[PDB]
């Protein structure tokens, strides 16, 4: 099958940024190339085909064209909707095949999360396993250290984080991080505590809680 | 109007089999070809098959061929996708396509997609564990602990409540279960004055919950 090589695999630029998104075909294709907008959990979208036709009712910002084997779309103006995984689409011959993506990010300024730390419930408890909870709100950028400490000492390999996708509208990001503990374990230690360290704040912020007041 | 509907997803165990629909509307299958495209969560989109269904002529990837049968039924205005000895790298979503089109062989219309969970690990349903809000801005939410497969949905006050909603994509423990959090951000003194309730809906288990969330 024909290789379609994308790049770059990622990027961020801001609102009103000249983006420029390249694929390059291994064979010839012709000008039988397509590109596909995804957004997470739904299906891709069609913005372009035969290399450099737009499709109705995308935007004018959204444009393609071809030098060769190179193929390139051109988004002349981003928007904070534009968040997405691009794909570029040979089909010139079977297999069709697909470019790996482009995870196009908006760059903005600096926010810091407000943070929040919830205690595992009395009904999770009696499974055998207890949850707890840091709430990393409405931040920019995505990049965030979030360390658990239990007893004031630091924890490894037993968390997990969570992250939605950039907010349609203020471009912030929110994160989930669980650390997960068995009940007996959970049982033996009081001070639970979540430290997030980010750009956007001056020095780490903490929230913790202790077992037995909540 | 068009349409693509796909059907026919689910868990199944490996080596096994499955058979997928897509049901086509607003247009008739035998003016152009169907194809299915399949994504692996976290991965590329790969095609998979093609059947032009007048003649009914089909192509296959490489990496299903022998196995997978795409075939048609242009009465019904419906392309199946038959999937044989299943592997683990089988599952992904599945969406069918279409080209649409005389000398137009991109894909202008897609369905929503099928998720296919190649898995020896039994159906399990969710619980659900409220987050309380413990006191600017306060925080509760709801945990959706340890279901199998994917995937959960999650609305708050029958989705009456959206502004400052943040459901998280689910992470898989190495259990081999799911656990996903919703939470919403409020105003501290809102607490005393609103109920709020996580509605949570697990369809591979049926299994329906809403946990009022108490401060």
């Known amino acids: 099958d024909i290789q379609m090589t994308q790049s770059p695999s990622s990027l961020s630029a801001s609102v009103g940024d000249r983006v420029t998104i390249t694929c390059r075909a291994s064979?010839?294709?012709?000008?039988?190339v397509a590109w596909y907008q995804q957004k997470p959990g739904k299906a891709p979208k069609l913005l372009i085909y035969?290399?450099?036709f737009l499709y109705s009712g995308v935007p004018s910002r959204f444009s393609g064209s071809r030098s060769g084997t190179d193929f390139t779309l051109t988004i002349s103006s981003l928007q904070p909707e534009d968040f997405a995984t691009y794909y570029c689409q040979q089909h010139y011959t079977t297999p069709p095949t697909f470019g790996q993506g482009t995870k196009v990010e908006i760059k903005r300024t600096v926010a810091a999360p407000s943070v929040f730390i919830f205690p595992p419930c009395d009904e999770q408890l009696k499974s055998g396993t207890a949850s707890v909870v840091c709430l990393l709100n409405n931040f920019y950028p995505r990049e965030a250290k979030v360390q658990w400490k239990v007893d004031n000492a630091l924890q490894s390999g037993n968390s997990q984080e969570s992250v939605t996708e950039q907010d349609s509208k203020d471009s912030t990001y929110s994160l989930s991080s669980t650390l997960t503990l068995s009940k007996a374990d959970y049982e033996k230690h009081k001070v639970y505590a979540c430290e997030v360290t980010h750009q956007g704040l001056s020095s780490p912020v903490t929230k913790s809680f202790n077992r037995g007041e909540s | 109007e068009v349409q693509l509907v796909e059907s026919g997803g689910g868990l199944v165990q490996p080596g096994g089999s499955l058979r997928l629909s897509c049901a086509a509307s607003?247009?008739?299958?035998?003016?152009?070809?169907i194809h299915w495209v399949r994504q692996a969560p976290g991965k590329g989109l790969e095609w998979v098959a093609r059947?032009?269904?007048?003649?009914?002529?089909?192509r296959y990837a490489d990496s299903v061929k022998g196995r997978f049968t795409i075939s048609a039924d242009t009465s019904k205005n419906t392309a199946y996708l038959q999937m044989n000895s299943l592997r683990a790298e089988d599952t992904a979503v599945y969406y069918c396509?279409?080209?649409?089109?005389?000398?137009?062989?991109?894909?202008?219309?897609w369905g929503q997609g099928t998720l296919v969970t190649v898995s020896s690990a039994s159906t399990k349903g969710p619980s659900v564990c409220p987050l309380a809000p413990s006191s600017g801005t306060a925080a509760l939410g709801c945990l959706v602990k340890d279901y199998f497969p994917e995937p959960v949905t999650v609305s708050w006050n029958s989705g009456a409540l959206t502004s400052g909603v943040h459901t998280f994509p689910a992470v898989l423990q190495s259990s081999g279960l799911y656990s996903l959090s919703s939470v919403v951000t409020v105003p501290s003194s809102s607490l005393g004055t609103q109920t709020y309730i996580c509605n949570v809906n697990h369809k591979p288990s049926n299994t329906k919950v809403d946990k009022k969330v108490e401060p």
């Open positions: 059947i032009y269904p007048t003649n009914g002529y089909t």
């Open positions: 396509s279409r080209w649409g089109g005389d000398g137009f062989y991109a894909m202008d219309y």
């Open positions: 035969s290399a450099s």
């Open positions: 064979q010839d294709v012709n000008t039988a």
């Open positions: 607003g247009f008739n299958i035998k003016d152009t070809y």
